[PDB]
Design a protein around this ligand. Structure first.
Ligand code: 544
Ligand code: 9CR
Lengths: 10, 272, 232, 16
């Protein structure tokens, strides 16, 4: 899940 | 309300509960744990054991519904349908004992039962289960979780959600006196679609809720947040029911001769 | 602070509104796009609120301390109920209708015409009106949403009990909150928790619709909402 | 809707 996983690791 | 009133309510419900439901949890666990002398249940867990198990459509009194004739799956399906029909009648009677219920608009009485019935059936079904399987036929038998899971096509996915629910629900260790109040709380839900007069229903539920809360404090003094863990189960029941309804829709599509008992069609027509 | 400080849950809720300004983008002056379909305008709001949802969860005590994969799971499993709970509570300020995060107001008849009445009416009667009648405040809403977020039954969790424990801490903080703020009403805590059964059934039915507005396409939806819709 | 049998059960109950 590109978006969700990305948004969470910042 | 005063504690005495809450205690009277809880005792009243317990009595009418014992009188509506022949098989209580206490009697069920006594059988599962094998601590009740009067013949132990036969374990049906696979094709060859079920064949030996004539406790469903044979040597006894031909009551259990279906007998191979059209597969083991249709069998079980009809068996639950029948168990479902007996519960509706029992639940219906039990509901008439809840103070204030018969005084509600008849239409609302019908609606509350229409939506509450299956949530209650699954609640009570948990009493007949354990991590490995479920009791069947007044306790006269025992079908394993593994076997029900192995049924063909979609039939094999019916019980698993129920077993998952039962394990977590049984972890709460509630007794019949607890369940009696919980069940009444489920019936008196003011959020059911189509209700005409919500307030009367909510007012009665508030008193049942306070009764339940007091019951749990007294009956389970060492279990923290039990009241909240139990009410949480009421939303889990929503998922089990809708998920179950969906599967009944798959069966309806993949099988021309679905055939459902009229009481269930009536309940299931335009549900949620 | 106290495991589950109710002040921080309120701040999470407040930090990610609306709350003025955000109510004008497309309700009285302009409005990018131009979609002719209530379902479209709603799916756009959902998609937009999906980004703010991540930030909100990050402000919920202990969420960010869970493994990264556990957080993903929790959000994929609870996003629709979380989003439905937000706009339903926001819509207490309006009559027979819903207020989207995009500042757009969706009226009853439009939804009925679009063919999504019924599900829309359930939202209004089982969620919006119930919140209004008992007047649940933002702290309570925040706690209910946190209870939804912390679902120990989500498939794949590395430590289900750790999640259950967090949910129980919210149970404790919310109950304490009700007794301190609403001592006049002994049964408010339970009434708050009994708002969840309808949230779940309405959410499931909603997902059922989304999985139809997809397996038919015709002018697709937005990225992210579409990503969450790839099923849990 | 109607719900014929539910009405009956509420009204009377169930035979033996
Ligand atoms: C119509 C229907 C079917 C359904 O749930 C199913 C379909 C396919 C596979 C498995 C299950 N189910 C009911 C709800 C219900 C009632 C009783 C119950 O277990 C009660 C325990 C019990 N008793 C028997 C049984 C008895 C006699 C012969 C064969 C099997 O089996 C079980 C699991 C479970 C679920 C509904 O939708 O209304
Ligand atoms: C509303 C609605 C639906 C789904 C909504 C979802 C999944 C999220 C909404 C979020 C909003 C409305 C957020 C906000 O505005 O903050 C469906 C398609 C089932 C049917 C029509 C009504």
């Amino acid at each position: 899940h590109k978006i969700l996983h990305r948004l969470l690791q910042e | 309300p005063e504690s005495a009133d809450l205690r009277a309510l809880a005792k009243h419900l317990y009595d009418s509960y014992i009188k509506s439901f022949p098989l209580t949890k206490a009697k069920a666990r006594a059988i599962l744990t094998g601590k009740t002398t009067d013949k132990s249940p036969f374990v049906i867990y696979d094709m060859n054991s079920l064949m030996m198990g004539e406790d469903k459509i044979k040597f006894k009194h031909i009551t259990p519904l279906q007998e191979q004739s059209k597969e083991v799956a249709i069998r079980i399906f009809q068996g639950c349908q029948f168990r479902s029909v007996e519960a509706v009648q029992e639940i219906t009677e039990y509901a008439k004992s809840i103070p204030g219920f018969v005084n509600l608009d008849l239409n609302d009485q019908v609606t509350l039962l229409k939506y509450g019935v299956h949530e209650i059936i699954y609640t009570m079904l948990a009493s007949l289960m354990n991590k490995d399987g479920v009791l069947i036929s007044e306790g006269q038998g025992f079908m394993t979780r593994e076997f029900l899971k192995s049924l063909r096509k979609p039939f094999g996915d019916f019980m698993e959600p129920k077993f998952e629910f039962a394990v977590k629900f049984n972890a709460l260790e509630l007794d019949d006196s607890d369940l009696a109040i919980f069940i009444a709380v489920i019936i008196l839900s003011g959020d059911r679609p189509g209700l005409l007069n919500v307030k009367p229903i909510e007012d009665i539920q508030d008193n049942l809720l306070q009764a339940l809360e007091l019951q749990l404090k007294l009956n389970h003094p060492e279990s923290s947040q039990l009241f909240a863990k139990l009410l949480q189960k009421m939303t889990d029941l929503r998922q089990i029911v809708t998920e179950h309804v969906q599967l009944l829709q798959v069966i309806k599509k993949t099988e021309t001769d679905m055939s459902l008992h009229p009481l269930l069609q009536e309940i299931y027509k335009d549900l949620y | 602070n106290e495991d589950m400080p109710v002040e921080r849950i309120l701040e999470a809720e407040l930090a990610v509104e609306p709350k003025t300004e955000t109510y004008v983008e497309a309700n009285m002056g302009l409005n990018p796009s131009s979609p002719n379909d209530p379902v479209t305008n709603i799916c756009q709001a959902a998609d937009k609120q999906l980004f703010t949802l991540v930030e909100w969860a990050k402000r919920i005590p202990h969420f960010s301390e869970l493994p990264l994969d556990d957080q993903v799971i929790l959000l994929r499993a609870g996003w629709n109920e979380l989003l439905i709970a937000s706009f339903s509570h926001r819509s207490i300020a309006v009559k027979d209708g819903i207020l989207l995060a995009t500042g757009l107001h969706v009226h009853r008849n439009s939804a009925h015409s679009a063919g999504v009445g019924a599900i829309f009416d359930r939202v209004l009667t089982e969620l919006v009106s119930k919140m209004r009648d008992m007047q649940m405040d933002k702290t309570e809403l925040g706690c209910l949403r946190a209870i939804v977020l912390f679902n120990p039954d989500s498939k794949g969790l590395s430590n289900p009990a750790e999640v259950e424990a967090l949910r129980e801490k919210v149970y404790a903080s919310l109950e304490a909150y009700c007794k301190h703020k609403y001592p006049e009403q002994p049964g408010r805590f339970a009434k708050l928790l009994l708002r969840l059964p309808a949230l779940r059934s309405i959410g499931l039915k909603c997902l059922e619709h989304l999985f139809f507005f997809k397996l038919i396409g015709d002018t697709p939806i937005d990225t992210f909402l579409m990503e969450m819709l790839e099923a849990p």
